[PDB]
């Protein structure tokens, strides 16, 4: 690709059909074309020969095709393109991800496999490549750039230097470097991050960014280095600033409450900037099943008042432009027939989906087989023995200690509190929730490291997860050691996943036997298990939106973020490079 | 070597350090209102530049930090202009002199199809083009001439390009794709030669640029199914709308002043600037270049006719950079190339400053740097034929009376027939008829002057000889008498090529074009001034009737690929039948 489009026999045939001398393979008839260049909705029929669109012409003027697809009463769009996403967050395999989003009209994704990368390293990125190769969904890979996210502060399953990055950039499956979240290293010209960027520039592929909270001087410096896109948009003003700065915007639907501000900001401008694309970022399996993938970013934007023509152009032509793929994103003679027929421009229900000229879905149902990929290398990734309640408690000598605390959910700061000591162990003080992290990849000693969170409500029980961005070590939150050991051991035994315990019983398990990140069960089952897990965790603790929510359970160990975080090494501070081994300050 | 030149480690470290505030900029542009071509806003900003890079776009007056400060106070800051389809040869001057004119007006990149030198000298001509642009402050991306000669077997130029030659040209790093394919029919009909040429463009993965004059509907679909992806030949506002709907890159040209109203209306009515619209000059005479002059004048005229400055500049910068796959161009943003023009306002587009790759190249309409010239040797000596005589211009026949074929009407050529007396040994030019005599002048054939009889060209009390005659450029002479035709013809032969007027036994004006017969090595001032006088002298010989019976018609009468009869160096050509009439005498 796109040399498959350029075959002489296929071109002669596409041209002869366009001419009216040969029939199409496929005619899409009676539809209204979403013309993503002019923004018009206009009747046209579509003539397709093999993987090419051969003609865009007057309704009902041709009737000669091997196959006719009825778009009467409906709308014809280029298939949708997601510019930034992670299959792993949906908790299923790439084949199951494909069956879900292709039936919804998604024909191209840009997949940063950094979760698999942190677990299995380069073999992770290889599995991802293998797994996409014969899907009806095109998947362009990005090379994970920050593994682990904070070198020297945490240990995942892998470590990627400038050389590993250059080697991944050499792969034809890899379309650039995946979101660079070590912003300081780029801006301050740290050797490792700078070597990675330089590799990205030397390969002449995309260098994708994570620019959360970057403003003014810092952003100019992030872009001067070569970082050229961002999805970490925190507000309508942030969007405008980032547009003005000249970044390609990867507009995500994963923070839904921000979509109305994005819409108001763009409507105030009066035109959709050609640098705006859409992406899903990280979609949970229940939201994937019920809402959708990239199609739901289109649907939600429109729901919030963005013209369906702007939503679609962002999801098609602008994204193809970003990707340098002038075969994609546009229903035009000479382009690839990745096409979706939508019942209307509010529900975006896909009546038909073609990928490279072949009908692959109808009415929400796959019409073709999706090849699976052997998952063996992903199994057996929990490499630690079962935990003891005492794994969760902190040893100390005296009878009263000063304790460092990790203060506030999400916007973390150093705290301090007091605690009694009994039986050689510290006594979980009032207002504190334990966070315990254990290296589970076998690259380090499996020693449970426990910290004391503050501002996380009162936990009556525990939650264990093997999804824990980005090191994905075994991570347990709890109100008492006993329930933390039940939850931990349940996910160890299933080979990874999530579990809730309360009052000496395990109340919910979601098995994620692949890498501790995903499951091979069908989406419907993973979705339902996830809702039940959310139900069960809800009985353990009262959420206080926003910030003190369930999702915060997967981000507490993300060591590259500002402020203290508990990791599998201790409490980490990226600003100093200091890992605190024990939380006991004194006594 | 671009854009790897931007990617050097020590340059990027310095750009990053400067953006951060730890090191100074090499250049600051201060006080200006930035034209943000992404957002469509005119918004105050200052610009910081390191080496070839824009290192920073920041709050006005926040940095004073620079090796040189360039003042934009009271003015507008824009990306340098990009011209997506043009021919230096039309302006009758060298690429160095063209560079001097347009650089000083803020045009920093041109896309040049050198098919005039190509038809005259073949590959050596394309080769001389690449050499001459090498170290100009003007970037020029070359396109490979696609149609040489324009209509094989109907005319003879100085060269013949098949698919193998195209494939060779396409491997040059200087070549950005295939130049305007004007043999539309050979593409639509899958002619073997045209098809191999296109297939060679698809195989190189470079641009395939079109000429799609009068193509509609099925024929337009076929031309694009072949892979042709841009056009500049827009015949109306509705043709503009239909080519935009069809998904072509538009090369919106100013070479046809009278359509601009239609184009502006169709775009204003649409209500946004589609991102596929770019601007081009196509063919600019030296007087228009000098008074006008280049891609700046296309912005300037569109604005004056009612296009928003913001759209005109977007088309001139970002949209072209996207078409060209050059994400270092077309936008003032940190991490892109510092090609920048500062405009006094958005009505005059007067260029206060111009920078190229971070270097101030022009100020106040004057060049600040040396423009290197190129050895013109290969272009000399291109008139390969003996002097003409009266008799070269008369048609030898046998009877007393004769049925004569005529070429009726200028521009919209159509077959005619008239009666003519034969005085002595030659046809006597019938009343209302003007001679067109064309002689092969490249030495690929005998220099036999081939004579036809035009109708609808006024009455000629004299002759005009030209060695510029699209696209084969043979010696082309128009006139009412043979002695005046001889003299005009021999004048331009004697100078090595050019244009001359003769009337009543006297040459009234001569413009030498000793370089290929197409251009001169004299300053633009002189060429422009000679060209005006030449126009004045020809006005004395025949009375024009706009449009159509105009002086420019004299340079398009032999273009054989156009529908309708045309005198060529071989006889009367007709691309509809594939036939050459060697004598105008039917009977
Ligand atoms: Mn991110
Ligand atoms: Mn992400
Ligand atoms: Mn992650
Ligand atoms: Mn043309
Ligand atoms: Mn042209
Ligand atoms: Mn020409």
Task: For CATH 2.30.40.10, list the domain ranges present in chain B.
Answer: 1-79+326-363
| Beta carbons within 8 Å of A73's beta carbon, 6+ residues apart | A30, A343
Instruction: Name the maximum alpha-carbon separation found in chain B.
Output: 93
Of A12, A49, A221, the CB nearest to B19: A221
In angstroms, what CA-CA distances link B230 with B126, B142, B550?
21, 16, 29
Tokens of A494: 């299933």
Whether the CB-CB separation of B466 and B491 falls below 8 Å is answered with no
Instruction: Give burial (CB, 10 Å; 0-12/13-18/19+) of A134.
Output: exposed
Chain B residues touching residue A217 (CB < 8 angstroms): 19-21, 56, 58
Q: How far, in Å, CA of A530 to CA of A536, rounded?
A: 10
The residues of chain A that CATH labels 2.30.40.10 are 1-78+325-362
If you classify domain B80-325 with CATH, what class do you get?
alpha beta
Q: Tokens 């290293």 label which residue?
A: A185
Q: Edge to edge, what strands does the sheet with B351-356 contain?
A: B41-44, B33-36, B76-79, B340-343, B351-356, B359-363, B366-367
Q: What angle do CA B563, B566, B568 make, to 5 degrees?
A: 130
Alpha-carbon distance A528 to A550, whole Å? Answer: 16
**Which of A20, A198, A330 is opposite residue B247, by nearest beta carbon?**
A330
Contact (Cβ atoms closer than 8 angstroms) between residue B190 and residue A16: yes
Contact A192, A153 (CB under 8 A): no
Dihedral sign (CA B234, B236, B240, B243): negative
User: Chain B interface, mutation test: which of A4, A6, A15, most B Cβ atoms within 10 Å?
Assistant: A15
Across the interface, of B41, B55, B275, the residue whose CB is closest to A274 is: B275
Instruction: Please identify which residue in the block is written with the tokens 């939201």.
Output: A287
Residue B575 CA to ligand 2 centre (angstroms)? 58
Q: What are the residue ranges of helices labelled H in A247-353?
A: 259-269, 285-290, 294-303, 308-315, 317-323
Residue B515 near residue B377 (C-beta atoms within 8 A):
no
Partner-chain contact B58 A220, CB within 8 Å: yes
- Asked if B571 and B582 touch (Cβ cutoff 8 Å), the reply is yes
Q: Where are the beta strands (DSSP E) in B41-153?
A: 41-44, 46-50, 53-58, 66-71, 76-79, 81-86, 107-112, 139-144
State both tokens at B111. Answer: 């896309």
How open is the CA angle B535-B539-B541, to the nearest 5 degrees? 120
Ligand nearest to the CA of A85: 2
- Residues 6+ positions from B448 with CB-CB distance below 8 Å: B439, B440
Q: What is the number of H-type helices and E-type strands within chain A?
A: 16, 32
A144: Cα within 13 Å, side-chain hemisphere: 26
The distance of B64 to chain A (nearest Cα, Å) reads 14
Nearest by Cα to B207 from B341, B320, B297, B375: B320
**B15 and B9 Cβ atoms separated by less than 8 Å:** no
Query: Cα-Cα-Cα-Cα dihedral of B176, B181, B186, B192, to 10°?
Result: -20
As a whole number of angstroms, the distance between CA B246 and CA A38 comes to: 10
Are B188 and A37 within 8 A, CB to CB? Answer: no
Q: Please, are residues B84 and B251 in contact by the beta-carbon 8 Å criterion? A: yes
Residue among A189, A330, A335 whose CB faces B16 most closely: A189
- In the structure encoding, which two tokens stand for residue B496, read together? 């090595």
Question: Which backbone phi and psi does A143 adopt, to 5 degrees?
Answer: -85, 125
Three-state DSSP at B219 gives helix
Nearest Cα to A259, choosing from A212, A316, A300, A314? A300
C-alpha to C-alpha distance for B22 and B39, rounded to whole angstroms: 30
Sequence ranges of chain B with CATH classification 3.20.20.140: 80-325
Residue from the list B190, B221, B274 with its beta carbon closest to the beta carbon of A57: B221
Chain B residue with Cα closest to A61: B218
| Interchain proximity B203–A6, CB inside 8 Å | yes
Q: Are strands B41-44 and B33-36 parallel, antiparallel or unpaired?
A: antiparallel
Residues of chain A with CATH 3.20.20.140: 79-324
**For A418, which DSSP code?**
E
Answer for the pair A520, A276: CB distance below 8 angstroms, yes or no: no
Write out chain B residues lying below 8 Å of A224, CB-based.
12, 15-16, 18-19, 50, 53, 55-56, 334-335
Strand stretches in B223-326, DSSP E: 230-231, 249-253, 277-280
Pairing state between β B175-181 and B139-144: parallel
d(CA B229, CA B231) in angstroms, rounded, equals: 7
Nearest to B435 by CA among B395, B466, B401, B467: B395
Cα–Cα separations (whole angstroms), residue A95 to A4, A69, A98, A364: 23, 26, 5, 16
How many C-beta atoms surround the C-beta of residue B69 within 10 A? 15
Task: Show Cβ contacts of residue A307 under 8 Å, excluding neighbours closer than 6 positions.
Answer: A39
Cα A413–chain centre separation? 27
Among B190, B222, B244, select the one facing A37 at the smallest CB separation.
B244
The token pair at B432 is 């209302």
**Chain B residue nearest residue A227, CA to CA:** B335
Q: A73 and A48 in contact (C-beta within 8 Å)?
A: no
Is A220–B59 a contact, with Cβ atoms under 8 angstroms apart?
no
Question: A327, A316 in Cβ contact below 8 A?
Answer: no
Comparing alpha-carbon positions, the chain A residue that sits nearest to B57 is A220
> Is the domain B1-79+326-363 a CATH 2.30.40.10 member?
yes
What gap in Å lies between CA A499 and CA A504, rounded to an integer? 13
Q: What H or E segment, with its residue span, contains residue A358?
A: strand A358-362
Beta bridge partners of A354: A339, A359
Which token pair is B172?
A: 């040059």
CATH of domain A1-78+325-362: 2.30.40.10
Q: In degrees, to the nearest 5, what angle opens at C-alpha B17 toward C-alphas B11 and B21?
A: 140
Identify from A40, A334, A336 which residue to disrupt to test chain B contact, counting B C-beta atoms within 10 A and taking the largest count.
A334
- Pick the residue from chain A with its C-alpha nearest to B267: A38
Tell me if B331 and A201 make a contact (CB, 8 A cut-off): no
**What is the spatial distance between Cα A382 and Cα A155, in angstroms, rounded to a whole number?**
14
How far is it, in rounded angstroms, from Cα B230 to Cα B24?
Answer: 43
Do residue B218 and residue A19 have CB atoms under 8 angstroms apart? yes
Residue A238's contacts (CB-CB under 8 Å, 6 or more residues apart) are: none
Nearest CA in chain A to B332: A246
Residues, CB-to-ion distance under 5 Å, ligand 3: A 469-470
Secondary structure in 3-state letters for A463-474: EEECCCCCCCCE
3-state secondary structure of A278: strand
Residues of chain B with C-beta less than 8 angstroms from the C-beta of A52 = 225
Tell me the C-alpha distance between B18 and A182, whole Å.
20
Calculate Rg over the CA atoms of chain B. 25
User: Rounded to an integer, what distance in angstroms lies between the CA atom of residue B262 and that of residue B285?
Assistant: 23
Tell me how many helices (H) and strands (E) chain B has. 16, 31
For residues B152 and B190, the answer to whether their CB atoms sit within 8 Å is no
- Are A18 and B203 inside 8 Å of each other by CB? no
Are A550 and A535 a contacting pair, CB within 8 Å? no
Classified as helix, coil or strand, A75 is strand
**Dihedral pair phi/psi, residue A299, rounded to 5°:** -60, -45
Please give the helix or strand (H or E) that residue A487 lies within, else none: helix A481-493
Is B38 within 8 Å of A11 when comparing Cβ atoms?
Answer: no
**Residue A98 to residue A138: CA distance in whole angstroms:** 9
Closest residue of chain A to B250, computed from CA coordinates: A37
CB contact (8 A) between residue B40 and residue A194: no
Strands A339-342 and A350-355: antiparallel
CB contact under 8 Å between A321 and B275, yes or no, is yes
The Cα A321–Cα A325 span in angstroms is 6
Q: Contact A224/B21, CB-based, under 8 Å?
A: no
CA B438 to CA B392: how far, in whole Å? Answer: 10
> Out of B4, B18, B225, whose CB is closest to A333?
B225
Rounded CA-CA distance B127/A436 in Å is 69
Rounded to the nearest 5°, which phi and psi values hold at B111? -110, 105
Long-range contacts of B265-269 (CB under 8 A, 24+ apart): B265/B237, B265/B306, B266/B237, B266/B238, B266/B240, B266/B241, B267/B240, B267/B307, B267/B311, B268/B306, B268/B307
Sorted by sequence, the CB contacts under 8 Å of residue A369 that are 6+ apart come out as none
- Domain A79-324 is classified in which CATH homologous superfamily? Metal-dependent hydrolases (3.20.20.140)
Q: Which residue has the tokens 């296929």?
A: A10
Of B351, B266, B360, B258, nearest to B313 (Cα)? Answer: B351
In chain A, whose CA is at the least distance from the CA of B18? A221
Q: Tell me the ligand closest to B255's alpha carbon.
A: 5
The torsion defined by the Cα of A396, A397, A402 and A403, in degrees rounded to 10, comes to 0
Question: Which residues in B lie closer than 8 A to residue A11 (C-beta atoms)?
Answer: 195, 198-199, 202, 225-227
Contacts of residue B38, defined as CB under 8 A and 6 or more positions apart, other chains included, come to A243, A244, A246, A273, A274, A275, B318, B331, B333
CA dihedral A120, A123, A128, A129 (to 10 degrees): 170
Return the biggest CA–CA distance within chain A: 93
Measure the CA–CA gap between B208 and B196, rounded to whole angstroms: 13
CA distance B383 to B362: 37
Ramachandran region of residue A50, left (φ > 0), alpha (ψ -120 to 50) or beta?
Answer: left
H or E element at residue B241: helix B237-246
d(C-alpha B23, C-alpha B477), whole Å: 65
Q: B152 vs chain A: nearest CA distance in angstroms?
A: 22
The rounded distance, in Å, linking the Cα atoms of A406 and A404 is: 7
CB contact under 8 A, A243 and B39: yes
Q: Which of A7, A35, A54, A220 to mutate to test the interface with B (most CBs of B within 10 A)?
A: A220
Beta-ladder partners of B422: B427
Residue entry with tokens 């309704």: A59
Can you give the length of chain A in residues? 587
* A49: β partners: A52
Q: How many CB atoms lie within 10 A of CB A191?
A: 10
Solving technique for this entry?
Answer: X-ray
Please report the DSSP string for B463-481 in residue order: EEEES--TTT--EEEEES-
Q: Are A534 and A500 in contact (CB under 8 A)?
A: no
Q: What are the E-state strand segments in A35-104?
A: 41-43, 45-49, 52-57, 65-70, 75-78, 80-85
Cβ pair A198:B19 closer than 8 A: no
CA atoms within 13 A on the CB side of B195: 17
Nearest Cα neighbor of A353 from A91, A26, A584 is A26
C-alpha B543/C-alpha B494 separation (Å) is: 28
> Could you tell me the distance, in angstroms and rounded to a whole number, from the CA of residue A534 to the centre of ligand 1?
24
List, in order, residues 6 or more apart from B80 with CB less than 8 Å away.
Answer: B106, B107, B108, B109, B317, B329, B339, B340, B341, B354, B355, B356
Residue A331 with chain B: CB contacts under 8 Å: 247
């Amino acid at each position: 690709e796109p040399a498959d489009l350029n075959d002489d026999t296929l071109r002669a045939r596409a041209v002869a059909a366009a001419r009216g001398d040969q029939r199409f393979d496929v005619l899409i008839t009676g539809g209204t074309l979403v013309d993503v260049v002019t923004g018009e909705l206009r009747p046209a029929d579509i003539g397709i020969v093999g993987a090419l669109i051969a003609s865009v012409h007057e309704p009902a003027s041709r009737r000669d095709a091997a196959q006719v697809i009825d778009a009467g009463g409906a709308y014809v769009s280029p298939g949708l393109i997601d510019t930034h996403m992670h299959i792993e967050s949906s908790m299923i395999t790439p084949a199951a991800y494909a069956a879900a989003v292709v039936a919804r009209g998604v024909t191209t994704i840009v997949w940063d496999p950094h979760e698999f990368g942190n677990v299995h390293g380069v073999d992770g990125v290889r599995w991802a490549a293998k797994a996409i190769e014969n899907l009806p969904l095109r998947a362009i890979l990005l090379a994970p750039s920050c593994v682990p996210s904070a070198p020297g502060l945490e240990r995942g399953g892998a470590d990627f230097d400038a050389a590993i990055l250059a080697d991944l950039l050499s792969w034809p499956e890899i379309g650039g470097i995946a979101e660079i979240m070590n912003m300081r290293g780029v801006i301050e010209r740290d050797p490792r991050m700078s070597g990675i960027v330089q590799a990205g520039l030397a390969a002449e592929k995309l260098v994708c960014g994570h620019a959360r909270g970057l403003k003014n001087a810092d952003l100019n410096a992030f872009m001067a280095a070569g970082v050229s896109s961002d999805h970490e948009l925190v507000s309508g003003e942030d969007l405008m600033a980032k547009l003005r700065a000249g970044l390609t915007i990867e507009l995500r639907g994963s923070h839904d409450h921000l979509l109305p501000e994005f819409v108001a900001a763009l409507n105030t401008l009066g035109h959709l900037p050609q640098t705006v694309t859409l992406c899903t970022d990280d979609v949970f399996p229940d939201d994937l099943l019920q809402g959708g993938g990239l199609d739901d970013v289109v649907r939600r934007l429109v729901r919030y008042g963005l013209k369906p023509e702007w939503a679609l152009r962002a999801a098609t032509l602008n994204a193809a432009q970003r990707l340098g793929r002038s075969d994609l994103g546009l229903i035009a003679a000479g382009r690839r027939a990745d096409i979706v027929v939508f019942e209307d421009l509010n529900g975006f229900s896909a009546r038909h989906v073609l990928a490279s000229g072949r009908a692959v879905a109808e009415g929400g149902r796959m019409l073709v087989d999706i090849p699976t990929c052997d998952t063996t290398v992903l199994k057996g990734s929990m490499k630690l023995p079962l935990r003891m309640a005492n794994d969760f408690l902190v040893k100390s000598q005296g009878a009263k200690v000063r304790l460092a605390t990790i203060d506030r959910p999400r916007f973390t700061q150093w705290g301090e509190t007091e605690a009694d000591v009994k039986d050689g162990f510290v006594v979980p003080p009032e207002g504190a929730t334990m966070i315990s992290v254990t290296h589970r990849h076998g690259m380090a000693e499996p020693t449970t490291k426990t910290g004391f969170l503050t501002g996380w409500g009162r936990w009556n029980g525990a939650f264990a997860t093997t999804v824990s961005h980005d090191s994905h070590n075994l991570t347990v939150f709890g109100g008492n050691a006993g329930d933390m050991a039940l939850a931990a051991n349940a996910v160890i035994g299933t080979g990874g996943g999530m579990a809730v315990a309360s009052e000496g019983k395990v109340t919910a398990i979601l098995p994620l036997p692949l890498s501790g990140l995903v499951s091979d069960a069908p989406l419907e089952e993973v979705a339902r298990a996830f809702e039940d897990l959310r139900e069960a965790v809800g009985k353990v603790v009262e959420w206080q939106p926003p910030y003190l929510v369930f999702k915060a359970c997967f981000g507490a160990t993300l060591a590259c973020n500002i402020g203290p975080h508990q990791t599998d090494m201790g409490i980490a501070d990226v600003l100093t490079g200091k890992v605190m081994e024990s939380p006991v300050i004194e006594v």
